[PDB]
Amino acid sequence: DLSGKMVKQVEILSDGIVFYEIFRYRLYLISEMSPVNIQGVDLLEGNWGTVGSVIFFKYTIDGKEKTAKDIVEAIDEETKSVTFKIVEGDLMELYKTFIIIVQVDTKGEHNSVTWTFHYEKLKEDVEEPNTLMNFCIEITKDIETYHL
Ligand SMILES: [Cl-]
Numbered sequence: 001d002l003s004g005k006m007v008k009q010v011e012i013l014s015d016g017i018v019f020y021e022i023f024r025y026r027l028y029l030i031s032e033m034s035p036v037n038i039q040g041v042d043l044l045e046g047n048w049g050t051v052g053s054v055i056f057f058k059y060t061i062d063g064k065e066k067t068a069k070d071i072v073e074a075i076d077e078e079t080k081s082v083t084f085k086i087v088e089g090d091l092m093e094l095y096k097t098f099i100i101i102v103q104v105d106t107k108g109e110h111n112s113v114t115w116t117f118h119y120e121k122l123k124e125d126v127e128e129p130n131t132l133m134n135f136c137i138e139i140t141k142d143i144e145t146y147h148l
Helices: 016-025 029-033 130-145
Strands: 003-012 036-045 054-061 065-078 081-089 093-103 111-122
Touching: 003 016, 003 130, 016 029, 016 081, 016 093, 016 111, 029 036, 029 130, 036 130, 054 081, 054 093, 111 130
Parallel strands: none
Antiparallel strands: 003 111, 036 054, 054 065, 065 081, 081 093, 093 111
């Protein structure tokens, strides 16, 4: 009831392999590639690209500065997937639980990035995370257009 799921697949022009490299091992590059959206990506514990690593994000949503602390809960290298669980931050005032999965289809033929949110709202009247999903799609477009 308070439970929800949201899925968006977007086709990318850029190399899926580089998208996965970013999201697994070089996540700090997103501050450079989507500087309107992301002001800081700071590793707090562990190492980049390892399950159990803890990462702090400074980001802007609707011109408001927000933060989150996330743990990397899962990595699947064969499917090119990484699962982030948000443990602290502005989102935790609206959601009890929030999990973000990013998965890159690297056929090479055509490449795409699928974003999945699994969340538990604190109340029934809390909104579905549409704005966050728009935010994630904007970062994807910023990343794929960064090379040009
Ligand atoms: Cl690992």
